[PDB]
Enzyme design. Structure first.
Site, mmCIF file in Angstrom:
data_model
loop_
_atom_site.group_PDB
_atom_site.id
_atom_site.type_symbol
_atom_site.label_atom_id
_atom_site.label_comp_id
_atom_site.label_asym_id
_atom_site.label_seq_id
_atom_site.Cartn_x
_atom_site.Cartn_y
_atom_site.Cartn_z
ATOM 1 N N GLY A 35 0.830 -1.138 -0.032
ATOM 2 C CA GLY A 35 0.046 -0.071 -0.086
ATOM 3 C C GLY A 35 0.767 1.241 0.093
ATOM 4 C CG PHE A 48 -0.221 -9.820 5.422
ATOM 5 C CD1 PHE A 48 0.041 -8.714 4.747
ATOM 6 C CD2 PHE A 48 -0.752 -11.050 4.799
ATOM 7 C CE1 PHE A 48 -0.226 -8.623 3.274
ATOM 8 C CE2 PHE A 48 -1.078 -10.811 3.304
ATOM 9 C CZ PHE A 48 -0.880 -9.788 2.724
ATOM 10 C CG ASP A 87 -8.563 8.684 7.551
ATOM 11 O OD1 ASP A 87 -9.357 9.449 6.728
ATOM 12 O OD2 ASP A 87 -7.483 8.264 6.990
ATOM 13 C CE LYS A 103 -8.443 6.606 3.689
ATOM 14 N NZ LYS A 103 -7.698 7.101 4.676
ATOM 15 C CG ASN A 158 -7.585 3.060 6.560
ATOM 16 O OD1 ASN A 158 -7.453 4.195 7.220
ATOM 17 N ND2 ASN A 158 -6.725 2.721 5.671
HETATM 18 C C1 CK4 Z 1 -3.104 1.066 4.856
HETATM 19 C C2 CK4 Z 1 -2.934 -0.026 5.674
HETATM 20 N N1 CK4 Z 1 -2.450 0.038 6.919
HETATM 21 C C3 CK4 Z 1 -2.465 -1.463 7.336
HETATM 22 C C4 CK4 Z 1 -2.042 -1.930 8.896
HETATM 23 C C5 CK4 Z 1 -2.661 -2.344 6.216
HETATM 24 C C6 CK4 Z 1 -2.583 -3.737 6.195
HETATM 25 C C7 CK4 Z 1 -2.308 -4.992 7.088
HETATM 26 C C8 CK4 Z 1 -2.399 -6.202 6.597
HETATM 27 N N2 CK4 Z 1 -2.811 -6.687 5.552
HETATM 28 C C9 CK4 Z 1 -3.221 -5.649 4.437
HETATM 29 N N3 CK4 Z 1 -3.568 -6.116 3.101
HETATM 30 C C10 CK4 Z 1 -3.723 -5.556 1.679
HETATM 31 C C11 CK4 Z 1 -4.066 -6.372 0.672
HETATM 32 C C12 CK4 Z 1 -4.327 -5.951 -0.407
HETATM 33 C C13 CK4 Z 1 -4.056 -4.555 -0.995
HETATM 34 C C14 CK4 Z 1 -4.716 -4.189 -2.224
HETATM 35 F F1 CK4 Z 1 -3.744 -3.006 -2.691
HETATM 36 F F2 CK4 Z 1 -4.458 -5.141 -3.408
HETATM 37 F F3 CK4 Z 1 -6.036 -3.579 -2.293
HETATM 38 C C15 CK4 Z 1 -4.096 -3.800 0.265
HETATM 39 C C16 CK4 Z 1 -4.003 -4.148 1.716
HETATM 40 N N4 CK4 Z 1 -3.078 -4.330 4.953
HETATM 41 S S1 CK4 Z 1 -3.063 -1.320 4.934
#
Ligand code: CK4
Length: 290
Positions: free
Chosen positions: A11, A74, A119, A121, A124
């Site tokens: 991200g 994750f 925030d 969204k 998030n």
């Molecule tokens: C902003 C974020 N803050 C945190 C802690 C995030 C987080 C924690 C654990 N997993 C993920 N996964 C994830 C998986 C796929 C996508 C996407 F970009 F493909 F849509 C975006 C995020 N994101 S994203």
């Protein structure tokens, strides 16, 4: 920090960039957030103990040579992505209702401990193949800040910002998270953002055109607000039936309460959990493509 092996730019948040990492020891997969005043450190550190099944677990905090790395558990997908991937058919009501229920659960927990997200969204909110939905980057707004822009050389989204924030209120409450969740809820139903403003005034006016220009009648004290202008166009309130079709009467009732202008009148997360809309709530599994 040399304990992780970056895997891919997952991200690009407002605080910093996010990578998928592999703890070289335990081999566990985490979300590495590279982002400071000691105040922030105490703040983002108190969050380590705020654990809940619907809150993205903050595994650890790494502050090396004035570099702040945040390690979270994750999850393979965020709602924004799932929502786009469900564009043609949309998310089944049962799933929508389950997600809001869990999100309201996460919120009630955070709010009871006097912590706000500030925030929320779609990007998030993270989902797993178990039918679980969790709040990410919680409490990270107070721990730091949130300007109109950032270093990410990117643009902020005000689509989910409550009116009290847009009107200059400096001491807003947990009710801003409910407004935001109401917007997301409507977005899950219509497959279209509720108030996709492109500036603070456009954001505020899109809200005005739909819910009606607020006044002392529906929002006592609103005209005292810092950014309130007696010159705002007077828009009539548009019937909610035209806002979130084809959501049923129970949902439209919950939504309208999550979108009350008066923060004090706005429904609380705990109280929303007892709304008839969740009377037949279940926990279905989504169909994700990873
Ligand atoms: C902003 C974020 N803050 C945190 C802690 C995030 C987080 C924690 C654990 N997993 C993920 N996964 C994830 C998986 C796929 C996508 C996407 F970009 F493909 F849509 C975006 C995020 N994101 S994203």
């Amino acid at each position: 920090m040399e304990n992780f092996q970056k895997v891919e730019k997952i991200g690009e948040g407002t605080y910093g960039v996010v990578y998928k990492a592999r703890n070289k020891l335990t081999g566990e997969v985490v979300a590495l957030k590279k982002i400071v005043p000691s105040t922030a450190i105490r703040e983002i550190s108190l969050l380590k103990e705020l654990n809940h099944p619907n809150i993205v677990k903050l595994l650890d905090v790494i502050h090396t040579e004035n570099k702040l790395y945040l390690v979270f558990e994750f999850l393979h997908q965020d709602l924004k992505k799932f929502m786009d991937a469900s564009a043609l058919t949309g998310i089944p009501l049962p799933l929508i209702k389950s997600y809001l229920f869990q999100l309201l659960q996460g919120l009630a927990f955070c709010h009871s401990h006097r912590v706000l997200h500030r925030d929320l969204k779609p990007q998030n909110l993270l989902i797993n193949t178990e039918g679980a939905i969790k709040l990410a980057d919680f409490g990270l707004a107070r721990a730091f800040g949130v300007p109109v822009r950032t270093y990410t050389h990117e643009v902020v989204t005000l689509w989910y910002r409550a009116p009290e924030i847009l009107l200059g209120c400096k001491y807003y409450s947990t009710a801003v998270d409910i407004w935001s969740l109401g917007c997301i809820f409507a977005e899950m139903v219509t497959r279209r953002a509720l108030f996709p403003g492109d500036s603070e005034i456009d954001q505020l006016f899109r809200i005005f055109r739909t819910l009606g220009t607020p006044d002392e009648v529906v929002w006592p004290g609103v005209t005292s607000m810092p950014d309130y202008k007696p010159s705002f166009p007077k828009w009539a309130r548009q019937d909610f039936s035209k806002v979130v079709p084809p959501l049923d009467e129970d949902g439209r009732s919950l939504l309208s309460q999550m979108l009350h202008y008066d923060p004090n009148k706005r429904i609380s997360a705990k109280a929303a959990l007892a709304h008839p809309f969740f009377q037949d709530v279940t926990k279905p599994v989504p169909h994700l493509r990873l």
